[PDB]
mmCIF file of N, CA and C in Angstrom:
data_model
loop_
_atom_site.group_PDB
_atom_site.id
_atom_site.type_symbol
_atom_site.label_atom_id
_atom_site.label_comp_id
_atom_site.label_asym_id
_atom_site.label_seq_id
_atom_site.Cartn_x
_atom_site.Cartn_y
_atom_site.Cartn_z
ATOM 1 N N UNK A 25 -24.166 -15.110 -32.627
ATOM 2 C CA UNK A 25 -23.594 -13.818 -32.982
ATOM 3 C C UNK A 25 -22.091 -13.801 -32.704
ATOM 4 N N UNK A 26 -21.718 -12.660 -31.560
ATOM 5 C CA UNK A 26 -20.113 -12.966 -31.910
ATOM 6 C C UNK A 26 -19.858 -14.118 -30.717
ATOM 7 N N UNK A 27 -18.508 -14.337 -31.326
ATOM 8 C CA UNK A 27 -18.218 -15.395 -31.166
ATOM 9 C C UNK A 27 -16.591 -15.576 -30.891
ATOM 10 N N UNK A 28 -16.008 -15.058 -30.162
ATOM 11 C CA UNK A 28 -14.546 -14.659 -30.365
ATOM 12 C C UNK A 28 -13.424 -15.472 -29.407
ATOM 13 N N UNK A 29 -12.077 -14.914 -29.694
ATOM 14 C CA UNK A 29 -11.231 -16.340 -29.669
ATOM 15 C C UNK A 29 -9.710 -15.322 -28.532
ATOM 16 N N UNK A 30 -9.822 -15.323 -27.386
ATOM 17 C CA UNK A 30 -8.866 -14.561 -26.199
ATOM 18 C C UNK A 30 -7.799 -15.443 -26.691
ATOM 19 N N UNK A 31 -6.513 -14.541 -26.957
ATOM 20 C CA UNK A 31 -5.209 -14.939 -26.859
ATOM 21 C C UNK A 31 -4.766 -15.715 -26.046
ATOM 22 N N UNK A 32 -4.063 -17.019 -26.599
ATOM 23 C CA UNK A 32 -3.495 -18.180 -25.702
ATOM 24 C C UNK A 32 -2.571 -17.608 -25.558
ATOM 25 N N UNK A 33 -1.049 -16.863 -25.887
ATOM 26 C CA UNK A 33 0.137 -16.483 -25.410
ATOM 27 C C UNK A 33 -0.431 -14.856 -24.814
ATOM 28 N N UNK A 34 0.604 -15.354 -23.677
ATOM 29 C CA UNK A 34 0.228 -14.274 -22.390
ATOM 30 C C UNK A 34 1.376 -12.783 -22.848
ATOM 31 N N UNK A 35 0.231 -12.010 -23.155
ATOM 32 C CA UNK A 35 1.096 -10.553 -23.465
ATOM 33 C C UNK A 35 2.172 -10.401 -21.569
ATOM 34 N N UNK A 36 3.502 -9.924 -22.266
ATOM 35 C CA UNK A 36 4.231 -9.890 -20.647
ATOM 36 C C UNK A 36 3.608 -9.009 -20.237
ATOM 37 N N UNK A 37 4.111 -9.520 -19.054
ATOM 38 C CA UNK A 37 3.614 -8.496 -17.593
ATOM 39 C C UNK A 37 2.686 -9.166 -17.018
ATOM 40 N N UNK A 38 1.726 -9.967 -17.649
ATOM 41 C CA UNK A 38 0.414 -9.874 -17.562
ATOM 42 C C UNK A 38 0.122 -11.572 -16.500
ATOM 43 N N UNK A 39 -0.164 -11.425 -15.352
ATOM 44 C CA UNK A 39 -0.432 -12.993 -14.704
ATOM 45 C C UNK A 39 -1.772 -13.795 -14.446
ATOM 46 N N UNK A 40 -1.525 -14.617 -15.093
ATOM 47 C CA UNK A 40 -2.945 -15.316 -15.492
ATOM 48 C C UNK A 40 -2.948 -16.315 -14.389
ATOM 49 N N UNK A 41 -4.552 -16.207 -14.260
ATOM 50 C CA UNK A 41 -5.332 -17.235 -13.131
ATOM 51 C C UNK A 41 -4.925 -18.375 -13.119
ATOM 52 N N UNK A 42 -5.450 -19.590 -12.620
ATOM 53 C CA UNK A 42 -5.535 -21.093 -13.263
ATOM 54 C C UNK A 42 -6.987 -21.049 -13.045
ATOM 55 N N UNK A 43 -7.809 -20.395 -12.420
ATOM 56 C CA UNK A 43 -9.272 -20.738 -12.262
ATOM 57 C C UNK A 43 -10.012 -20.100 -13.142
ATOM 58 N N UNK A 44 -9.215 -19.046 -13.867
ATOM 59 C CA UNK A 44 -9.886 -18.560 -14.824
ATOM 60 C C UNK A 44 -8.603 -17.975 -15.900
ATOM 61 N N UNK A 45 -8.711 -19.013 -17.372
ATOM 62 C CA UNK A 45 -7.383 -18.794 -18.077
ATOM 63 C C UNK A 45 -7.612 -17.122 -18.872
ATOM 64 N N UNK A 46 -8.591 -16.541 -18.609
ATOM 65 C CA UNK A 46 -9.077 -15.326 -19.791
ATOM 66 C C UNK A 46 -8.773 -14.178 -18.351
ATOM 67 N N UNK A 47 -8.419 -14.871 -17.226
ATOM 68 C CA UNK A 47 -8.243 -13.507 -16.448
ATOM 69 C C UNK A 47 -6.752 -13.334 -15.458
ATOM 70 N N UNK A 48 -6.726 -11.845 -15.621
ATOM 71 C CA UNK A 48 -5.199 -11.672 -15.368
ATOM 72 C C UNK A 48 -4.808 -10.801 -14.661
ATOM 73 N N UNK A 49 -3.454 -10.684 -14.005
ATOM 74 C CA UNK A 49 -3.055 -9.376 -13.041
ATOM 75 C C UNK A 49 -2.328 -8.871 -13.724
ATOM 76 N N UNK A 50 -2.690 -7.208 -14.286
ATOM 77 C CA UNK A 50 -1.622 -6.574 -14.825
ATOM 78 C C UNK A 50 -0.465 -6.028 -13.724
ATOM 79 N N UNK A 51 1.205 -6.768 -14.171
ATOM 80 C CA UNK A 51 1.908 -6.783 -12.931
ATOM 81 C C UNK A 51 2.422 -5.039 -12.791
ATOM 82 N N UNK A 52 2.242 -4.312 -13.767
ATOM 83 C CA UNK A 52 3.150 -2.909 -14.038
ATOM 84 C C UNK A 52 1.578 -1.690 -13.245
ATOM 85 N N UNK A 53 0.750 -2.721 -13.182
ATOM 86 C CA UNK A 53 -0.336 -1.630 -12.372
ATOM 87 C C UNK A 53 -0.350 -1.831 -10.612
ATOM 88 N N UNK A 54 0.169 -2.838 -10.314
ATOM 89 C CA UNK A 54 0.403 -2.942 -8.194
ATOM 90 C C UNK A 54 1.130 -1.813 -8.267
ATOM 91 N N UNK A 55 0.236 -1.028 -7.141
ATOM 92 C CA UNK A 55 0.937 -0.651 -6.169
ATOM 93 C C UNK A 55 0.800 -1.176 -4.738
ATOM 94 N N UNK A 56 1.803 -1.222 -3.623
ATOM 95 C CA UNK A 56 1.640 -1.693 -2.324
ATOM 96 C C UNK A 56 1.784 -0.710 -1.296
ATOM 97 N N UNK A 57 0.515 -0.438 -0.724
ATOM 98 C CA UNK A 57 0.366 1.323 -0.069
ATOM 99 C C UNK A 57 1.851 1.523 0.827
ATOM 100 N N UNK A 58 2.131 2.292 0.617
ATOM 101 C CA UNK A 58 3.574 2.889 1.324
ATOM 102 C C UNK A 58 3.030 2.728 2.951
ATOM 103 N N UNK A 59 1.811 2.925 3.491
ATOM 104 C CA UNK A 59 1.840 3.083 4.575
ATOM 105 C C UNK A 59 1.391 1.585 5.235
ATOM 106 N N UNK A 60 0.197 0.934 4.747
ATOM 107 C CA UNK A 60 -0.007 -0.288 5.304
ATOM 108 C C UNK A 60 0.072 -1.207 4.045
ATOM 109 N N UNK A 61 1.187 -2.215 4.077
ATOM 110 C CA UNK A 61 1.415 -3.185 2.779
ATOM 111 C C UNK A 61 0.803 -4.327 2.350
ATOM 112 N N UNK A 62 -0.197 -4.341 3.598
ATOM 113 C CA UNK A 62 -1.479 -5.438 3.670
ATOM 114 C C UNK A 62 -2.675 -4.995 2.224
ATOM 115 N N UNK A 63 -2.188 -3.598 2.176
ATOM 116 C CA UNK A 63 -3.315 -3.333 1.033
ATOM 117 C C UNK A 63 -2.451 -3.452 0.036
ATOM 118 N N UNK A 64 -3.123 -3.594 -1.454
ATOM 119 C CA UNK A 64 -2.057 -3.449 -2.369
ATOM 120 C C UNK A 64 -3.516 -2.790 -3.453
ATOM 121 N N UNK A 65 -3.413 -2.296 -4.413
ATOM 122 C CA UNK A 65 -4.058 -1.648 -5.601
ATOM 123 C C UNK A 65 -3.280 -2.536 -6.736
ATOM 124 N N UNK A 66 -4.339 -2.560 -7.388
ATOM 125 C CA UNK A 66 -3.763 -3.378 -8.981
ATOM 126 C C UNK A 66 -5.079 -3.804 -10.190
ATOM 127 N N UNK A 67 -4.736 -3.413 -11.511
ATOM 128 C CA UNK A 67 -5.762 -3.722 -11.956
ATOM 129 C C UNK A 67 -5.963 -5.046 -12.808
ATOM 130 N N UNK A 68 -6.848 -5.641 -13.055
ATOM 131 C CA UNK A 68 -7.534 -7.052 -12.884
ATOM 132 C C UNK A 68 -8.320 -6.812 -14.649
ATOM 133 N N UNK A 69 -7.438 -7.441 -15.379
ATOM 134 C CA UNK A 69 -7.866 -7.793 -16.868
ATOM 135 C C UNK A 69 -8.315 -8.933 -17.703
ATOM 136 N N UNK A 70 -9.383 -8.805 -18.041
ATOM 137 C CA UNK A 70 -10.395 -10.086 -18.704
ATOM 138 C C UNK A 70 -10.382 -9.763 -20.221
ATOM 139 N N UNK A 71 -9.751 -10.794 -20.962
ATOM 140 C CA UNK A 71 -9.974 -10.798 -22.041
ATOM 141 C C UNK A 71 -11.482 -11.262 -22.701
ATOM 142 N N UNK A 72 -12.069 -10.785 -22.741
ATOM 143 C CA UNK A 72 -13.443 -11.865 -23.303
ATOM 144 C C UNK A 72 -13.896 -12.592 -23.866
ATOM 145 N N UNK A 73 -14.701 -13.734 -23.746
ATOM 146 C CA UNK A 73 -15.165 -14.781 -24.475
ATOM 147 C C UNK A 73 -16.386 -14.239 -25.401
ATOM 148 N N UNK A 74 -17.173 -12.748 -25.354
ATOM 149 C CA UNK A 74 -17.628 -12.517 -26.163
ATOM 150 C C UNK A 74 -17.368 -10.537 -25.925
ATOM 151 N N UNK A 75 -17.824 -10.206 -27.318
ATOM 152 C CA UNK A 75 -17.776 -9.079 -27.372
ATOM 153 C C UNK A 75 -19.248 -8.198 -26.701
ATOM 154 N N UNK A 76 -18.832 -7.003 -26.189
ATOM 155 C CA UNK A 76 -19.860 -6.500 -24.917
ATOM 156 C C UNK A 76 -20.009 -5.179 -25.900
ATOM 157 N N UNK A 77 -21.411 -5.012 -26.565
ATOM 158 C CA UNK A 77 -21.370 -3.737 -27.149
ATOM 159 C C UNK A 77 -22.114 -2.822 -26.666
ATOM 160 N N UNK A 78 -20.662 -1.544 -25.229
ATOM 161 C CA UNK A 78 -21.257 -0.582 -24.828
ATOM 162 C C UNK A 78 -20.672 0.335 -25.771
ATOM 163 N N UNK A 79 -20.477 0.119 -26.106
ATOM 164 C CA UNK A 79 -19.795 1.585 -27.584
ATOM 165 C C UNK A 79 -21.389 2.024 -28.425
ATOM 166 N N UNK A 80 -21.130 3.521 -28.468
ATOM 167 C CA UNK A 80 -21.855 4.582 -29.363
ATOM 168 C C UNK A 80 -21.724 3.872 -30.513
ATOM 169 N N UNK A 81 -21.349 3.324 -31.070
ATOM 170 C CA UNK A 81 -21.079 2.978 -32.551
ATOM 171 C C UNK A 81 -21.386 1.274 -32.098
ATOM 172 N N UNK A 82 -23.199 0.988 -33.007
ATOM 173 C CA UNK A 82 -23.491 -0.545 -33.293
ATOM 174 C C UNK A 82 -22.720 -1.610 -32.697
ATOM 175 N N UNK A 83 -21.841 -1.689 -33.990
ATOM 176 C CA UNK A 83 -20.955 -3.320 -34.203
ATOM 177 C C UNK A 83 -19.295 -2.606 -33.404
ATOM 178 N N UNK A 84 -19.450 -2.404 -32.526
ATOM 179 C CA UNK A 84 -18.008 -1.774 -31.713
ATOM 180 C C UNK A 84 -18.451 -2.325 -30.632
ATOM 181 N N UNK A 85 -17.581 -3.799 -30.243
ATOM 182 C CA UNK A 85 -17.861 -4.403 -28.801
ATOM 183 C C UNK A 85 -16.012 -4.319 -28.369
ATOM 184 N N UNK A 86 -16.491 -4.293 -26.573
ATOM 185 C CA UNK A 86 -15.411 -4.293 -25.668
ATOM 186 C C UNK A 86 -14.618 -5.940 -26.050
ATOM 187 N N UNK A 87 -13.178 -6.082 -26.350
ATOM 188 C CA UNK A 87 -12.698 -7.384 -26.413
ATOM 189 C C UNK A 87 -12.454 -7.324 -25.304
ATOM 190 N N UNK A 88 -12.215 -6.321 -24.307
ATOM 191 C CA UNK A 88 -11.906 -6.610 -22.394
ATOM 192 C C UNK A 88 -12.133 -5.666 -21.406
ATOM 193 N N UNK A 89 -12.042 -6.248 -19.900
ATOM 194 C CA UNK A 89 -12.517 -5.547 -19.093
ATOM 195 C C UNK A 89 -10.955 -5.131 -18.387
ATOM 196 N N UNK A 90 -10.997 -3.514 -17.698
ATOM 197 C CA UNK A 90 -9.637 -3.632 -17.057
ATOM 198 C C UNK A 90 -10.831 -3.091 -15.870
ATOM 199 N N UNK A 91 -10.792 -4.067 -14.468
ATOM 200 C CA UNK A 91 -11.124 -3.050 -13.009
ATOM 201 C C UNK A 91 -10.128 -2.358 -12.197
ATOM 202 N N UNK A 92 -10.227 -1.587 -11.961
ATOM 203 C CA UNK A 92 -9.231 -1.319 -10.487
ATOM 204 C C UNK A 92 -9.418 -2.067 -9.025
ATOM 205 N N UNK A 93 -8.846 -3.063 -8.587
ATOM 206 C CA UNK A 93 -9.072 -3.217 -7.219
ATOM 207 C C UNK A 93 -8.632 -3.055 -6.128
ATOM 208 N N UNK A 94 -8.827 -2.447 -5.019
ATOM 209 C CA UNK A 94 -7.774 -2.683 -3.839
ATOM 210 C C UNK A 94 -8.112 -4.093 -2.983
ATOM 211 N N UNK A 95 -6.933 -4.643 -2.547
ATOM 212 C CA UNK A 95 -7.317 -5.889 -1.807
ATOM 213 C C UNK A 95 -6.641 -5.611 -0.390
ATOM 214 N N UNK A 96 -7.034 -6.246 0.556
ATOM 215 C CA UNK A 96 -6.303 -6.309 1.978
ATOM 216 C C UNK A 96 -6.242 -7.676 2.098
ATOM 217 N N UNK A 97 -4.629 -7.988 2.420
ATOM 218 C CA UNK A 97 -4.502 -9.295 2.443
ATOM 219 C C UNK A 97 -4.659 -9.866 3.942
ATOM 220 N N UNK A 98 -4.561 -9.070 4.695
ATOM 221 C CA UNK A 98 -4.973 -9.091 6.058
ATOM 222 C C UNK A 98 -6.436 -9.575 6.174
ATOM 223 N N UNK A 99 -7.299 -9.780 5.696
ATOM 224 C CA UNK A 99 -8.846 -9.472 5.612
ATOM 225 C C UNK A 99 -9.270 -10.587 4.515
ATOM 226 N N UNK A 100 -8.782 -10.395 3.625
ATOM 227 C CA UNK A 100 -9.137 -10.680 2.245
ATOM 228 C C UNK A 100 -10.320 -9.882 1.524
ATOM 229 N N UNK A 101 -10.271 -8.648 1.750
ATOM 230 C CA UNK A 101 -11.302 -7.896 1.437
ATOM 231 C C UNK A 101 -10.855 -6.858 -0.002
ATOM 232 N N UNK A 102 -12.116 -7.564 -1.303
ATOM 233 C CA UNK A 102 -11.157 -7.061 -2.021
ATOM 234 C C UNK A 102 -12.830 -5.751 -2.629
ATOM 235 N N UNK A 103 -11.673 -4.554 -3.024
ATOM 236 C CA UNK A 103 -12.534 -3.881 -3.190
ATOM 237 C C UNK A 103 -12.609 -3.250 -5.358
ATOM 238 N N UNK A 104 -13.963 -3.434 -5.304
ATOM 239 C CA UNK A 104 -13.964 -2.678 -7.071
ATOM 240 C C UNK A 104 -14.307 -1.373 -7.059
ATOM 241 N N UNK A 105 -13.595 -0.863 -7.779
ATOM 242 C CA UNK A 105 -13.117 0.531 -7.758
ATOM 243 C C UNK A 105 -13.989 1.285 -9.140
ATOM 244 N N UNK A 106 -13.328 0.815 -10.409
ATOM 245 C CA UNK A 106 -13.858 0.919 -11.157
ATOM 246 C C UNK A 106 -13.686 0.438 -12.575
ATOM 247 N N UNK A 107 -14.571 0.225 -13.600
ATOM 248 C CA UNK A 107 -13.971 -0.700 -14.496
ATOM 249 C C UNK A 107 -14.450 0.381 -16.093
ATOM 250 N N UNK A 108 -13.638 -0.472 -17.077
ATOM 251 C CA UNK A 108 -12.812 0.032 -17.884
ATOM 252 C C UNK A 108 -13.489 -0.987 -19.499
ATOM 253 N N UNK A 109 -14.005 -0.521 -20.396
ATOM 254 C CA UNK A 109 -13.932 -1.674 -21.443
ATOM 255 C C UNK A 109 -13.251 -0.932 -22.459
ATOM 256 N N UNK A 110 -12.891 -2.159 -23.281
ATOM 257 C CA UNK A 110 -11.594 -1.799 -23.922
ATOM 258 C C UNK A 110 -11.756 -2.842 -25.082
ATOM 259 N N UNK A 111 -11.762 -2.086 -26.755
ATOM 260 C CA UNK A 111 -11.624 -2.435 -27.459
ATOM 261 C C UNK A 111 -10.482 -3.343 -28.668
ATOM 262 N N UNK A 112 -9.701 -3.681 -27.440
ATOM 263 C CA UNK A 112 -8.626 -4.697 -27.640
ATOM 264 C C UNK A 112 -8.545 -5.359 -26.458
ATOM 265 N N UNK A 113 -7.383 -6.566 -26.956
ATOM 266 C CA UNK A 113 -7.168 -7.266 -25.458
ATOM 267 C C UNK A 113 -6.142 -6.523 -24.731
ATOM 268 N N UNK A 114 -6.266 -7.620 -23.483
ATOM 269 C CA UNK A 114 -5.380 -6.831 -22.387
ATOM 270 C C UNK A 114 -5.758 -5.504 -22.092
ATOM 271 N N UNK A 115 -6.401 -4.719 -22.032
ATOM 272 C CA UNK A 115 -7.026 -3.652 -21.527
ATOM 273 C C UNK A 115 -6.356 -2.225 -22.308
ATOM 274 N N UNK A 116 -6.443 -2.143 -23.597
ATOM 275 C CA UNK A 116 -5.651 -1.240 -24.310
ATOM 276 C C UNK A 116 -7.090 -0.634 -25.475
ATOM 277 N N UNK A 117 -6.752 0.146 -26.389
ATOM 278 C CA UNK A 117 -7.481 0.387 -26.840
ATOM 279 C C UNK A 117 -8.177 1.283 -26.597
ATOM 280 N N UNK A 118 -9.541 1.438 -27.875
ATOM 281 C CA UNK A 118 -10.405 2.329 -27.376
ATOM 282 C C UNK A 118 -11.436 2.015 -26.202
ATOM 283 N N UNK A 119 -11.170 3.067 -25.014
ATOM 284 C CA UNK A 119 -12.069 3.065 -23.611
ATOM 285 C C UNK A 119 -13.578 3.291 -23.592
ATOM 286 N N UNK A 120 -14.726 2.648 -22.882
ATOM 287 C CA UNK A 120 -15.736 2.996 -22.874
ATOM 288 C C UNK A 120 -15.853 2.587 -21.303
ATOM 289 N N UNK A 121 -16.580 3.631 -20.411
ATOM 290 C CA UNK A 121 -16.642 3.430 -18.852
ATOM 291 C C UNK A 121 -18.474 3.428 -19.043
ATOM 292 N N UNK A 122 -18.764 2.807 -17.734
ATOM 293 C CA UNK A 122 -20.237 3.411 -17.605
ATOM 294 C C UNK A 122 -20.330 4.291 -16.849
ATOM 295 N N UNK A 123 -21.494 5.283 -16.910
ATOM 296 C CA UNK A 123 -21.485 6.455 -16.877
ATOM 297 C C UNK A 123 -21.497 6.810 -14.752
ATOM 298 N N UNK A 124 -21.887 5.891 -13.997
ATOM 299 C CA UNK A 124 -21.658 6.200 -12.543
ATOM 300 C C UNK A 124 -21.026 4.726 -12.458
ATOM 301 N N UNK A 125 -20.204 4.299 -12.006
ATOM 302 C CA UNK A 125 -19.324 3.772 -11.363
ATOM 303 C C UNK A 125 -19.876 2.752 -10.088
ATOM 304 N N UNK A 126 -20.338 1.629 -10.246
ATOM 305 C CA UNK A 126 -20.708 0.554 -8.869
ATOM 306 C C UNK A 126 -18.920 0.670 -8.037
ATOM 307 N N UNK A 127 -19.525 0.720 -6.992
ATOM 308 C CA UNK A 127 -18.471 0.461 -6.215
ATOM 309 C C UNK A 127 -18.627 -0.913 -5.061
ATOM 310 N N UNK A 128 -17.653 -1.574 -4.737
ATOM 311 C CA UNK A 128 -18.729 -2.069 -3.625
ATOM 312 C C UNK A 128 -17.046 -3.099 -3.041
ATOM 313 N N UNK A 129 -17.278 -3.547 -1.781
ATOM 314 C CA UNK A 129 -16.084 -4.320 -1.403
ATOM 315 C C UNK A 129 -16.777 -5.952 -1.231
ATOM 316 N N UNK A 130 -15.908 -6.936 -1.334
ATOM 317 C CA UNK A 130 -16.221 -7.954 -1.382
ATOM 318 C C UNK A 130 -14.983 -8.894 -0.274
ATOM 319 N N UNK A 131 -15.577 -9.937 0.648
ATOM 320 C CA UNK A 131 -15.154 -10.538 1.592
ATOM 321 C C UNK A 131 -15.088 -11.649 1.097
ATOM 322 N N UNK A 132 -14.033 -12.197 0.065
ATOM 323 C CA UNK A 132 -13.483 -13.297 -0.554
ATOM 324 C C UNK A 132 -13.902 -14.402 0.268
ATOM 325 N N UNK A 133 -14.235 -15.668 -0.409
ATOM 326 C CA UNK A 133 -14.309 -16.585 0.252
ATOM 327 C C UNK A 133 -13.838 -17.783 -1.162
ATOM 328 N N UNK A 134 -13.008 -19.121 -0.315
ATOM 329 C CA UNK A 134 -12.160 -19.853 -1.236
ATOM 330 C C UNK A 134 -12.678 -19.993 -2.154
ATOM 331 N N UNK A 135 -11.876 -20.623 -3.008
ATOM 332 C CA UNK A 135 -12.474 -21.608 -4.528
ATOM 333 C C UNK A 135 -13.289 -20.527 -5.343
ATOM 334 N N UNK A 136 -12.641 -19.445 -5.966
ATOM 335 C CA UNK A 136 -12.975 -18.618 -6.669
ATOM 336 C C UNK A 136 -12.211 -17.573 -7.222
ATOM 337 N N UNK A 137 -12.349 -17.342 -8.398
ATOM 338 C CA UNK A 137 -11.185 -16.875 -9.260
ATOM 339 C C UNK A 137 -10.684 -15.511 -8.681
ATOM 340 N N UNK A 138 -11.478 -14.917 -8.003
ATOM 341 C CA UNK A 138 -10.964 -13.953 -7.090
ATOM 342 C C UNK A 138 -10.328 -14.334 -5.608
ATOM 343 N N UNK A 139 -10.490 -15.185 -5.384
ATOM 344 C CA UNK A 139 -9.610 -15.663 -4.116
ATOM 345 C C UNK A 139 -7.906 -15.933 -5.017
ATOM 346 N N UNK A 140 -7.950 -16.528 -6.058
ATOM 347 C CA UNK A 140 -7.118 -16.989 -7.089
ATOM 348 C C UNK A 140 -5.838 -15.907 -6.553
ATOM 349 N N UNK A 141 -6.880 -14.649 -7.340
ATOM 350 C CA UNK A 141 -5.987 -13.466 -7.696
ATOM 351 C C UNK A 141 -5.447 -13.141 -6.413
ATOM 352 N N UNK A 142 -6.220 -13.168 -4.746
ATOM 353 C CA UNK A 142 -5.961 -12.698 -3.838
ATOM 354 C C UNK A 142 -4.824 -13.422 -3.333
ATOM 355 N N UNK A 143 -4.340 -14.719 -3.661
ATOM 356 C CA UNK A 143 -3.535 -15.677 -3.316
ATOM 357 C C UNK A 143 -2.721 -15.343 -3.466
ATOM 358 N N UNK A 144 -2.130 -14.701 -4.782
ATOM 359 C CA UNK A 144 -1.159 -14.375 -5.825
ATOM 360 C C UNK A 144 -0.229 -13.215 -5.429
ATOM 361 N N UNK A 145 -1.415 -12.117 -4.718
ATOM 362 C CA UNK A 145 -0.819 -10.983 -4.444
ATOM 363 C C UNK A 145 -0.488 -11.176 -3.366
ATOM 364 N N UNK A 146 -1.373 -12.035 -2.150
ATOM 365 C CA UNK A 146 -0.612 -11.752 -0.889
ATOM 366 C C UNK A 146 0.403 -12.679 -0.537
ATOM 367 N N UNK A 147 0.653 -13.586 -1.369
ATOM 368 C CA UNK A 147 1.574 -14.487 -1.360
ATOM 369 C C UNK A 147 2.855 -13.827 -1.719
ATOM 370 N N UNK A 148 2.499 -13.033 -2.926
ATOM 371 C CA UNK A 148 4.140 -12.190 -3.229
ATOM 372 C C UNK A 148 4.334 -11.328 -2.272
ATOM 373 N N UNK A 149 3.514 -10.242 -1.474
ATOM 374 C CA UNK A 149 3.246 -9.190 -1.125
ATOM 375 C C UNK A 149 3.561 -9.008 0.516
ATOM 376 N N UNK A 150 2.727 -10.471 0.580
ATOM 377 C CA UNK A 150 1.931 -10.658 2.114
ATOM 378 C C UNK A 150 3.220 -11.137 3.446
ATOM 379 N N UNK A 151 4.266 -11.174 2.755
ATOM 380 C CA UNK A 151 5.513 -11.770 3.570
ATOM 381 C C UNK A 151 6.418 -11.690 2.865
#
């Protein structure tokens, strides 16, 4: 069925993994909490390797996911907030959410495309 093809040139702003080339940090969404800078908020965009059809309308699949996460680089504790599908890449387009929201925090551990991302931020962030 589908079968689809994520943009090789990186829309700006946008910082891509090496552990995972379809996933990215949108840089214009960090924020770094004014009060403790160990946390930072930023949202986390997957272009997809296939189309996800939560859309009211049949043949209307998500080309991507945008989550919100907060991370503590102190910890490495990164938390999902909530996520976003989106009928274009890079997280634009028409929105479809699910209807209650998983939340849940996660205690990173190496060699994984989310440690990737956690590297990235607390490396810029973290000092």
């Amino acid at each position: 069925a589908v079968k689809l093809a994520p943009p090789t040139d990186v829309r700006s702003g946008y910082i891509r993994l090496v552990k995972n080339v379809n996933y990215y940090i949108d840089s214009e969404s960090i924020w770094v909490d004014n009060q403790e800078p160990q946390i930072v908020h930023f949202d986390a965009v997957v272009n997809l390797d296939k189309g996800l059809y939560v859309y009211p309308e049949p043949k209307r699949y998500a080309r991507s996911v945008r989550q919100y996460k907060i991370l503590n680089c102190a910890n490495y504790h990164l938390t999902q907030v909530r996520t976003d599908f989106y009928d274009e890449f890079w997280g634009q387009g028409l929105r479809a959410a699910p209807k209650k929201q998983k939340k849940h925090t996660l205690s990173l551990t190496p060699d994984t495309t989310l440690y990737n991302a956690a590297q990235i931020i607390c490396a810029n962030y973290g000092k």
